[PDB]
Design a protein around this nucleic acid. Structure first.
Ligand code: F2A
Ligand code: CL
Ligand code: CL
Ligand code: CL
Ligand code: CL
Ligand code: MG
Ligand code: MG
Ligand code: NA
Ligand code: NA
Length: 326
DNA sequence: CCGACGTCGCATCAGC
DNA sequence: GCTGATGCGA
DNA sequence: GTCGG
């Protein structure tokens, strides 16, 4: 937080462009600038100094000058005033509610936490759960609780089958002292890019996690992805821990490295790494890295034996998880 | 200029 | 039932 | 909103 004020302004501007203007390009632009400015080792002194950083053009440079001189931004001040803007922005904070659904509700007269409760009937399952744990999902998870959560997951997974390998990724693997949620990468030798020797692989795990009452709710569930809710167990007379979001991703074992790279993120890092990949003639996803033909066509998977192999193909120095928090 | 700016799983809808 | 677009999220 | 060709 050397330039915490500036990166917050741009983040607010990004959230506004995405939730209200439904303009993700302006969204990505602001996110990028906030990112590049967040890793800047100096205390920005002007818009011009910031403009030297890639991603900060003229418009943002001007906005930075204003912020520095007054400690605020009029454009955002007005946005905070506007009731529709603030209402939409607010509703998008409910898990499962996006710009579209937010603007729809405000068009129907639903614009507060109270309005959502007395209209639960208009929400799909996901939105209902996001509302039910609204306060809870707004809280950060101390690493200490992440560790206890890690332990429960790995151990409950081992009990279903010793061959399952569960790895906690996301901001946790990047070393954050706190996380917004828990992300779990799962692998089993019975599921490779060549065949699915077993069914209900993710199910069995989710099932066991529910059995021990760790997983409390489900937001969505397929054969390789599970998005839900979990809660650490508490002591006698001890207050309950908040419910937490939990994501599970089953990836073909032979595609592990590509999978853990993806799931470690951050999201912006992935976008940048993948963008850079395309310029170097490759395309990367959570399964593989394939070379692109002159006609823009995904070639066949390339051999990968480590995360570092992916960075090499694109000619990037390897970067430790703790340095991929862009 | 001014067009390009990662990738994909699941829930839901419309159309058939 | 299906496919395919869209919303929302990882 | 910013960038490179
Ligand atoms: N838009 C996107 N494009 C590409 N990859 C994306 C992505 N959103 C999420 N990911 C990937 C990388 C995240 O680390 C990882 C976890 O997704 P996540 O939403 O849990 C965010 P995380 O980075 O874990 O921080 P935190 O706020 O949860 O503590 O999923
Ligand atoms: Cl846009
Ligand atoms: Cl402001
Ligand atoms: Cl891989
Ligand atoms: Cl692939
Ligand atoms: Mg996370
Ligand atoms: Mg997550
Ligand atoms: Na710049
Ligand atoms: Na939301």
């Amino acid at each position: 937080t050397l330039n915490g004020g500036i990166t917050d302004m741009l983040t607010e501007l990004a959230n506004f462009e995405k939730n209200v203007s439904q303009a993700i390009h302006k969204y990505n632009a602001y996110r990028k600038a906030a990112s590049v400015i967040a890793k800047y080792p100096h205390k920005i002194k002007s818009g011009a100094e910031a403009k030297k950083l890639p991603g900060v053009g003229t418009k943002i440079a001007e906005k930075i000058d204003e912020f520095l001189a007054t400690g605020k931004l009029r454009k955002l001040e007005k946005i905070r005033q506007d009731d529709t803007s603030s209402s939409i922005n607010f509703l998008t904070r409910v898990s499962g509610i996006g710009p579209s659904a937010a603007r729809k509700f405000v068009d129907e007269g639903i614009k507060t936490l109270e309005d959502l409760r007395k209209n639960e009937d208009k929400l799909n399952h996901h939105q209902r759960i996001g509302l039910k744990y609204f306060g809870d999902f707004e809280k950060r998870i101390p690493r200490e609780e992440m560790l206890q959560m890690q332990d429960i997951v790995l151990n409950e997974v081992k009990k279903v089958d010793s061959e399952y390998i569960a790895t906690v990724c996301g901001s946790f693997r990047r070393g954050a002292e706190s996380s917004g949620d828990m992300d779990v990468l799962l692998t089993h030798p019975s599921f490779t890019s060549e065949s699915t020797k077993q069914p209900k692989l993710l199910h069995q795990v989710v099932e066991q996690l529910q059995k021990v009452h760790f997983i409390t709710d489900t937001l969505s569930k397929g054969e390789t992805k599970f998005m839900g809710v979990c809660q650490l167990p508490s002591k006698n007379d001890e207050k309950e821990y908040p419910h937490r979001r939990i994501d599970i991703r089953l990836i073909p074992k032979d595609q592990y490295y590509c999978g853990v790279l993806y799931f470690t993120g951050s999201d912006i890092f992935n976008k940048n790494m993948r963008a850079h990949a395309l310029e170097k003639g490759f395309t990367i996803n959570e399964y593989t890295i394939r070379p692109l033909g002159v006609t823009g066509v995904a070639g066949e998977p390339l051999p990968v034996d480590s995360e570092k192999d992916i960075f090499d193909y694109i000619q990037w120095k390897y970067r430790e998880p703790k340095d991929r928090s862009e």
